[PDB]
Amino acid sequence: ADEERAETARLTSFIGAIAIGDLVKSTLGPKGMDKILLSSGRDASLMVTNDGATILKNIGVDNPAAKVLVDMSRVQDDEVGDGTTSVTVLAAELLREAESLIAKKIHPQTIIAGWREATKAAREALLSSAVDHGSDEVKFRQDLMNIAGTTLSSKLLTHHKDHFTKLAVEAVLRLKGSGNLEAIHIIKKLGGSLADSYLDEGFLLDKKIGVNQPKRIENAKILIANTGMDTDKIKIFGSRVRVDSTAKVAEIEHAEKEKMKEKVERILKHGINCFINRQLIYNYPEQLFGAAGVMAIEHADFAGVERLALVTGGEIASTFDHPELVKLGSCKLIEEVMIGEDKLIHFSGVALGEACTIVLRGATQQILDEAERSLHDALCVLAQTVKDSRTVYGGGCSEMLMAHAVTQLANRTPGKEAVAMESYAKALRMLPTIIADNAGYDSADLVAQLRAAHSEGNTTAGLDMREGTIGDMAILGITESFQVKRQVLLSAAEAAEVILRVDNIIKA
Amino acid sequence: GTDSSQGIPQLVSNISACQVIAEAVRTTLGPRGMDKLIVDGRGKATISNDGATILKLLDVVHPAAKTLVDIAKSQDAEVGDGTTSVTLLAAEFLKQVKPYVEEGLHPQIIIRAFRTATQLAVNKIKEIAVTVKKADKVEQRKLLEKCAMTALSSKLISQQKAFFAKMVVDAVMMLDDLLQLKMIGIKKVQGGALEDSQLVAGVAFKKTFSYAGFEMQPKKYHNPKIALLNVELELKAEKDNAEIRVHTVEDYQAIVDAEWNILYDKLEKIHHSGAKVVLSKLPIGDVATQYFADRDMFCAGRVPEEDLKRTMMACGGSIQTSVNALSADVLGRCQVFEETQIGGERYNFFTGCPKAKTCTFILRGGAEQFMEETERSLHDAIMIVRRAIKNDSVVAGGGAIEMELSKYLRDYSRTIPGKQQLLIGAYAKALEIIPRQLCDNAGFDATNILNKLRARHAQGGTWYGVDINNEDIADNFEAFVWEPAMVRINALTAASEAACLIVSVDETIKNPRS
Amino acid sequence: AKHFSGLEEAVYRNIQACKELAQTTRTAYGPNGMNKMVINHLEKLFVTNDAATILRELEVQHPAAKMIVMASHMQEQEVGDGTNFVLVFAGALLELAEELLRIGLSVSEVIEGYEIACRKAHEILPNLVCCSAKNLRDIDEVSSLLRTSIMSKQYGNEVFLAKLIAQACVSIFPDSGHFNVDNIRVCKILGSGISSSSVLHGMVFKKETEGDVTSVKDAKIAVYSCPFDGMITETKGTVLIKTAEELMNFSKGEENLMDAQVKAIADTGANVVVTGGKVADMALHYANKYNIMLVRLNSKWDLRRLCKTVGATALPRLTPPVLEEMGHCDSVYLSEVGDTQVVVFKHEKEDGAISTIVLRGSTDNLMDDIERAVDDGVNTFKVLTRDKRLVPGGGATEIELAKQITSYGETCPGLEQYAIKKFAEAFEAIPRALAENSGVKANEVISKLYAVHQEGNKNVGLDIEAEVPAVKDMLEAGILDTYLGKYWAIKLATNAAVTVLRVDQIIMA
Amino acid sequence: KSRLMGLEALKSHIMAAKAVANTMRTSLGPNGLDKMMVDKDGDVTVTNDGATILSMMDVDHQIAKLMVELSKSQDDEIGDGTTGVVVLAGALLEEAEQLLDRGIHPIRIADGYEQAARVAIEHLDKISDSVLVDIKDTEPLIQTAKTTLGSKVVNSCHRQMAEIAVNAVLTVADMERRDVDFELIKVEGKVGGRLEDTKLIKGVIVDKDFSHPQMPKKVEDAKIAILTCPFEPPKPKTKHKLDVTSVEDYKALQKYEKEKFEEMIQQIKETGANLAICQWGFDDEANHLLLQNNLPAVRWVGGPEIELIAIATGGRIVPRFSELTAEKLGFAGLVQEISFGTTKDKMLVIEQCKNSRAVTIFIRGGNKMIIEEAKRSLHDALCVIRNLIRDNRVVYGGGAAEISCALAVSQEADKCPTLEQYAMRAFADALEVIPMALSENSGMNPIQTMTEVRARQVKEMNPALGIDCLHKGTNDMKQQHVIETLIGKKQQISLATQMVRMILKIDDIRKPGESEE
């Protein structure tokens, strides 16, 4: 085993999150800079990445210390949202903070509580400028809206931001006591629409109608089927192998075309004109099912009728054999909506109900991917804004207030560890600093002044480092739920002091 | 082709090489004498107090190096003791002869002075040879307890000796009909009353395996019928593997149960064959051991084969290679089978055995690093305690005799020589190296002590010799430090021979070339 | 390289090659010899005294010396003491030419010097025969020559191997007026002492004696290198554990498949079977049933030694053996050959010519060093039978010849004048060898051996007496070589020398 | 190969001995700063535990050999004490250099280390002779499980663990037997629970449950049918498992395999039980029959667990289905399928108020690192607790014992005028390195920090109070409750002191170099 003593261990503890943190601290903070992922270990590629993990995971994380945060920061993002770029930089900050204190010959243990207690009183000072915005629903609306727009920010989203700040809050204002990811049904395809998306009434489904089947279905009572047919319908006699030679090899394909027909017996027994199932059928099968005259819909989505049954008040169930193992679903129409060149079989039983389908049309998946996460991130920060509607001033203004207090605290608070608390407080104003030059602005005065300035009570007035200007965090809308900010404080403060207390690393 | 070298460059290389490896053996022997943990290959690490073992284990690439192995290996077979000394000695001449070959002067005769004074060496020590048995006590066995106490304290235990010294004498008197080093063999027990050896003329067993029947399978027999089994039984017994089907139509629950009963039979093949205690050197199936517990025929799985061999020697049994007992002779018997946890784990005691020829100590060590040198101290006694029996004639230990033997020859270094006082002094120089090797490897100056001893020998004395604890002047006879007289003779010939042997060879041929 | 140019083969190679081969003898010759360990392609330590023994395993590149090793093997078969002498003698003979090479005397010139002088010396050798003795029977008297010939070839017991090989060589024979190549073979066996060695005339199989004992008086063998697992003409059986049921049929079949074997053995006839290969489980148990002696799992050693002594020949297959393949021995019996209980035959007049000296010790090299001895006790006794002439022990005859061949140089004059002077010098490295093993100068030996100036007895051998070089009478010491020994040891050492002394550079493409 | 001797070996032994004492010294105790350790596998292990570090190290030498060996005799019996025994062995070896460099032969000092190892363990003997019964010691058991759960930083509110270790030792390992039971204590746990989700299960929890909740959750006292027999695929060990290869085969086996299990699950209940524990479980087809036949039973029981539920419950052995009989059954005080508070952790308990031959501590945790965080911590607790529930002999830890030892040691060291006069005195010096390296970890200068305890020993001349071990600034052995079993501290030494001296007696080593392990 390879014994790594503290000299490089603390050093490697520092380099791991810093060498990734610099990449995400571009993206993170306000926006003067980002990460453009230039991708070759796996390929010839050029990528633009505001996502921490897309920066983290794609590039080699192989540093055992970088393992921690790349593992730990993702969870923080997987938990409250947008925690990748956060837990990474903030601990990478502390790694710099530790490094000096390390290079100052200081016990990591002495540094632990110095930060760890400073983590509290900062989270406390974070709770101060955390300002509950639940007052009315319009307040809670615009709180969530300011908060939804907060996490979406510093990321590339084309038409996404303004629609989901409606939708995410829409998903919130329907569930009332939480937000809905259980409701919003994300449907992705090629629609030719740039980012353009909408709340989908009922849920659309993608299939070409053809062969003999008339395309539109009117007055459609769906027969909900959790078990459809793949190609051959599965039952006692469903499988055979007759092949003794190369002819039978071509003749066995012909034998299973019989099995498509016996599927009609099951559905013709149920009697409902509209049979909606999970398992798809093909176009040559469409001959046999469409000539049957009953309408058997293939690949009718579970979460789709799960939308219906919730909003339609009906029951979507599991284990479908005979018609009544699932309570019959009621739609107004099974229709084909044509979006551009697309042909989309569209089930409308309800409109914008407490379960919504969301049709995401884009020419690129990565933007639709980073749009989902920021949506996935916001609703979580919105669902906690349902819980804690404090929206704490962001954009580094929170860092300042905490940096000012904890510094004031370290002054009095310890007799020794005033080292680390201010060092902690120093790491606070760091994240502000890296992005002001990114607008060209001077962080020093800012972190000196505007901290003390708004830590003397301007706290709404804060950092616009997109403009490199001093502006109101509430009015600029730069602010977010007190949790996520404290949540992105929790892990990063914890992420650093782990490898901080790590003085040796075995390597096999 | 073939490579060869005659003359001194060979002989210098000869004497040089023989000095090289026997070096490693020098430092090793004593109570404080260094133990040699040798690592051959990689995961292979070996501690020895005896060189002959590591002589075989260490690489000897020379006629000079190889000839060192067997010579102490001879002494290893002689007393079971004294390898390192014989390894120390044969090459001791070489540095002593080194000026003589570096002066270039070696009449091939000069080897003969080795044997020559070795005569007087094997003489005086058998001339000063003294029976410990006949004179000491009447029983002679409390002498053996004296020899126990001294040879139990010869390696580790000064404190545990007296408690074990009766037990050593117990086994020595028991073991001496046919003596075999394993047949006193100690069975470790840890967690009972520590620092206590418990001798049973029968045999305790390390391994017994039962669960579901761990403690609910009968552990006691007032006579065991013991199938000594190298057999392996598994979840189920023999069934046809080729062209067999499970899950078929009617065979699903039939063949599983058919596998069951054949196992019961092959497990019962042991039971109804007159096996009460089933000692199975090889694995027993999980539910198979349950069936042993089901049939009330005691099962011991993965028994140590020596426990099976200690069985046949104590219990009148023999190892059965098949489950069904071949005979009642291979069936082991005792008049007691007791399974008693000392320290809290199951041991199979075969005691009250028909032969009961393999003695077993039940020994409790104080700790991890401490425990073994006790167990070594136990076997050390029984060797030289029985060797106090073996050779009645005994000389003071601790190199006591070799001291004056230096004088006696350095008398002849004075007395006879036309020349060979060199030879005679070189020979006599080889004598006291060991107590010098002993006291100094402890870290106490032997030269001073040895000289004072010989200074005390000078007035008059023979048995004046180092007691090795503080390793200083004493009388090993009076100190009760003994090895028999012949034991020195046993070393005197062999080591003084190899000197003669390697030196008469100035020319070493190797046919493979190189 | 074995290919050379640059006069090395002439003025260098030979004198280098000789002392390489030699200067074993220098410490290996005389009243004793100092053993020299040999390792083979098999790694092990083989101590050597006889010249041809250390050189047998020594593998030489020397184009020079390959002539001379044969001469030792020639000398060995002939007499057996003096093979040492032969190497160290030619050690003196050749090198003296280097001076005559510096002095400028040509090749054949000085060669004619040693030649006509070794002709002159061979003339004197019968004159320098000092007394004589022999008995075609007596152990003790014959032992002394067999003692003193193996002296050079043994440092060990001189009298004990004297008495054994004397017994052996003699008592294997009705006469020992005749003596042959193998009249004695050896079962090398450890245990007890090396002087526990015993002379048992017959073929010893130190191998197992198995089968039920059937004959004692009938030792006649049908000798087989054929294993008996069932190996026989119609079905050649082996031992196959491959399956259990096939093993069941083996035990059944083998009893019968072994049946037609020891049958055909005793058909062509024998009650004793020499099986150079294996014998199976039920094969031997059938021999227990068949009532024949199978001496099984023998060596090629115990196979050939019998095949040598009985004149028979091992069968790798089983066909009915002929009498050419079946030997008879006096009696087959179980007796201890130096305290070792196995089958030891008796051989005198049935087929015969094998004594077994059991070579003994605590190791095989002790049995190899006593192998050194009795081989000469074999060889010298033949010479002893060929000529009972006794000649001063090696080095006591030299001082005679040197004086004679000295003034013979001044009967020579002409370039062989000095070469014969050098041939008078060619004698005297032998006691030098003796004294150099003793470590002392022969320069004191030489003058004392010249002190009385006759040289019929006086010599300085290998002793603690020689520790201060001291004239002893090898003649009177019981050290008396045989004339042929004294004749042969001079002849080939002079013969192999002169032919390798005219060699030139090797020509190679 | 090669033979290295004396100073060569002397620099072969302490060298590999010196470094691993260092990785553990900043890992030492609660303030011992944890060590992230990563395999070649991409693994990560954050380890202040020497045994875990040793389990993490394959590092190569007789030392590294003996080190991975030495701690784990302390880690099972005593548990806590794993770290100090090694680091101090290095400190002893750290001394022997200079002390042989003073010209004192390595065996001239050797006894002196062991000779003075007497006073330390003898001084430890003096600390607390207290021995308390289970119901009394349970507080000192958890008061020590304050400390012995403390180092892994899973301790408070884990008095659950502390208390479940109180009974788990007592249940199987008696107080009077004083033969260690960590074998009949079943250490058990599952991911998805929580540290504060903690239980001591008296009998055997079998992971799988009855074939349905539609049949009762509860089997009464005993009636456990011990079974090796397929009601699901057997996978027999004599032949190989294969399934139906034909269409008519799924016809007949479906019809055949049902009615037999109908009969057999009835034949189980015919033989009788409310619980049939099957080595080879009920299939889903056999599940509905266990429902249909109206019998409760377990589906899956481990191949070993069919012995476990037999032995651990004391249930009289029923080998298989063919050996089914009424008088032989697995036993229970009761049988439940118990939700542990996180339905993710769900077991069917066969619980023993009759006889528990394997008592089951069932820890829970969000994941595996967290339950192992608890378990090895619970282990060392359970360890010391069992030691204490045997004999409650304790000692105030953190070296204030050894600071009190070392002074008394080095004093009594000087008393023997033999050269170990000095050599034993230097032994005592090593006794001070562990609280030292702890005071390093504590964030304090150990030099002055120990002299506080030294002064406190100059005050007390035994530990009562002390310095910090946890980092607070309230410096106490008693009130901070830094306390170890008096046993294992002596066992630390006995393991620590001799291995050095044993390596002292063995410097004669055939190696090309140290790395041969």
UniProtKB/Swiss-Prot annotation, chain A:
GO molecular function, one term: protein folding chaperone
Pfam families: Cpn60_TCP1
InterPro entries recorded: Chap_CCT_beta (IPR012716), Chaperone_TCP-1 (IPR017998), Chaperonin_TCP-1_CS (IPR002194), Cpn60/GroEL/TCP-1 (IPR002423), GroEL-like_apical_dom_sf (IPR027409), GROEL-like_equatorial_sf (IPR027413), TCP-1-like_intermed_sf (IPR027410), TCP-1_chaperonin (IPR053374)
Phosphoserine: modified positions: S45, S245
Keyword terms, alphabetized: Acetylation, ATP-binding, Chaperone, Cytoplasm, Hydrolase, Isopeptide bond, Nucleotide-binding, Phosphoprotein, Ubl conjugation
UniProt catalytic activity: ATP + H2O = ADP + phosphate + H(+)
Annotated positions binding Mg(2+): D82
Residues engaged in binding ATP: G29, G83, T84, T85, E480, K485
Record flagged with keyword Chaperone: yes
Single Gene Ontology BP annotation: chaperone-mediated protein folding
Residues engaged in binding ADP: G29, G83, T84, T85, S86, S153, S154, G395, E480, K485
Residues annotated with Phosphothreonine modification: T246
Enzyme class: hydrolase
A Gene Ontology term for the protein's cellular component: zona pellucida receptor complex
Record PTM N6-acetyllysine, positions in chain: K139, K166
Location of this chain's protein in the cell: Cytoplasm
EC number, UniProt record: 3.6.1.-
Main location: cytoplasm
Glycyl lysine isopeptide (Lys-Gly) (interchain with G-Cter in SUMO2) cross-link, chain position(s): K233
Family: Belongs to the TCP-1 chaperonin family.
NCBIfam families registered for this protein in UniProt: chap_CCT_beta, thermosome_beta
Role according to the record: Component of the chaperonin-containing T-complex (TRiC), a molecular chaperone complex that assists the folding of actin, tubulin and other proteins upon ATP hydrolysis. The TRiC complex mediates the folding of WRAP53/TCAB1, thereby regulating telomere maintenance. As part of the TRiC complex may play a role in the assembly of BBSome, a complex involved in ciliogenesis regulating transports vesicles to the cilia.
Protein name: T-complex protein 1 subunit beta
UniProt gene name: CCT2
UniProtKB/Swiss-Prot annotation, chain B:
Residues annotated to bind Mg(2+): D81
SUPFAM superfamilies, A to Z: GroEL apical domain-like, GroEL equatorial domain-like, GroEL-intermediate domain like
EC numbers: 3.6.1.-
Resulting phenotype, E368K: Found in a patient with developmental delay, intellectual disability, pyramidal and cerebellar signs, cerebellar vermis hypoplasia and hypoplasia of the corpus callosum; uncertain significance
Primary location: cytoplasm
InterPro entries with a match to the protein in the record: Chap_CCT_eta (IPR012720), Chaperone_TCP-1 (IPR017998), Chaperonin_TCP-1_CS (IPR002194), Cpn60/GroEL/TCP-1 (IPR002423), GroEL-like_apical_dom_sf (IPR027409), GROEL-like_equatorial_sf (IPR027413), TCP-1-like_intermed_sf (IPR027410), TCP-1_chaperonin (IPR053374)
Keyword annotations: Acetylation, ATP-binding, Chaperone, Cytoplasm, Hydrolase, Isopeptide bond, Methylation, Nucleotide-binding, Ubl conjugation
Entry-linked CDD domains: TCP1_eta
Glycyl lysine isopeptide (Lys-Gly) (interchain with G-Cter in SUMO2) crosslink location in chain: K419
Reaction equations catalysed: ATP + H2O = ADP + phosphate + H(+)
Protein name as catalogued: T-complex protein 1 subunit eta
Native organism: Homo sapiens
Swiss-Prot record, chain C:
Name the UniProt record assigns to this protein: T-complex protein 1 subunit theta
Keywords: Acetylation, ATP-binding, Cell projection, Chaperone, Cilium, Cytoplasm, Cytoskeleton, Hydrolase, Isopeptide bond, Nucleotide-binding, Phosphoprotein, Ubl conjugation
Gene of this entry: CCT8
Main subcellular location: cytoplasm
Localization terms from the record: Cytoplasm; Cytoplasm, Cytoskeleton, Microtubule organizing center, Centrosome; Cytoplasm, Cytoskeleton, Cilium basal body
Binding site for ADP: Y29, G30, G82, T83, N84, F85, M151, S152, K153, G394, D481
Modified residues (Phosphotyrosine): Y12, Y487
Database matches in PANTHER family: CHAPERONIN
Family in the record: Belongs to the TCP-1 chaperonin family.
Residue numbers carrying N6-acetyllysine: K300, K382, K448
Reactions listed under catalytic activity: ATP + H2O = ADP + phosphate + H(+)
Function: Component of the chaperonin-containing T-complex (TRiC), a molecular chaperone complex that assists the folding of actin, tubulin and other proteins upon ATP hydrolysis. The TRiC complex mediates the folding of WRAP53/TCAB1, thereby regulating telomere maintenance. As part of the TRiC complex may play a role in the assembly of BBSome, a complex involved in ciliogenesis regulating transports vesicles to the cilia.
InterPro entries: Chap_CCT_theta, Chaperone_TCP-1, Chaperonin_TCP-1_CS, Cpn60/GroEL/TCP-1, GroEL-like_apical_dom_sf, GROEL-like_equatorial_sf, TCP-1-like_intermed_sf
Gene Ontology CC entries for this record: azurophil granule lumen; cell body; centrosome; chaperonin-containing T-complex; cilium; cytoplasm; cytosol; extracellular exosome
Amino-acid positions noted as binding ATP in the UniProt annotation, renumbered to this chain: G82, T83, N84, S152, K153, G394, D481, K486
UniProt source species: Homo sapiens
From Swiss-Prot, chain D:
Ligand binding (ATP): G29, T82, T83, G398
EC number of the protein: 3.6.1.-
Enzyme class, UniProt record, top EC level: hydrolase
Cross-link type Glycyl lysine isopeptide (Lys-Gly) (interchain with G-Cter in SUMO2), residue numbers: K186, K190, K241, K251, K255, K368
SS bond list: none
Catalytic activity from the UniProt record: ATP + H2O = ADP + phosphate + H(+)
Residues recorded as bearing Phosphoserine in the entry: S2, S322, S515
Keyword Hydrolase: yes
MF terms in GO: ATP binding; ATP hydrolysis activity; ATP-dependent protein folding chaperone; beta-tubulin binding; G-protein beta-subunit binding; mRNA 3'-UTR binding; mRNA 5'-UTR binding; protein folding chaperone
GO cellular component terms listed in the entry, alphabetical order: cell body; centrosome; chaperonin-containing T-complex; cytosol; extracellular exosome; microtubule
Residues that bind ADP: G29, G81, T82, T83, S151, G398, D468, E484, K489
Record InterPro entries: Chap_CCT_epsi (IPR012718), Chaperone_TCP-1 (IPR017998), Chaperonin_TCP-1_CS (IPR002194), Cpn60/GroEL/TCP-1 (IPR002423), GroEL-like_apical_dom_sf (IPR027409), GROEL-like_equatorial_sf (IPR027413), TCP-1-like_intermed_sf (IPR027410), TCP-1_chaperonin (IPR053374)
Binding site for Mg(2+): D80
Annotated compartments: Cytoplasm; Cytoplasm, Cytoskeleton, Microtubule organizing center, Centrosome
Swiss-Prot/TrEMBL induction comment: Down-regulated in response to enterovirus 71 (EV71) infection (at protein level).
PTM info: Ubiquitinated by the DCX(DCAF12) complex specifically recognizes the diglutamate (Glu-Glu) at the C-terminus, leading to its degradation.
Keyword field: Acetylation, ATP-binding, Chaperone, Cytoplasm, Cytoskeleton, Disease variant, Hydrolase, Isopeptide bond, Neuropathy, Nucleotide-binding, Phosphoprotein, Ubl conjugation
Family: Belongs to the TCP-1 chaperonin family.
Annotated gene: CCT5
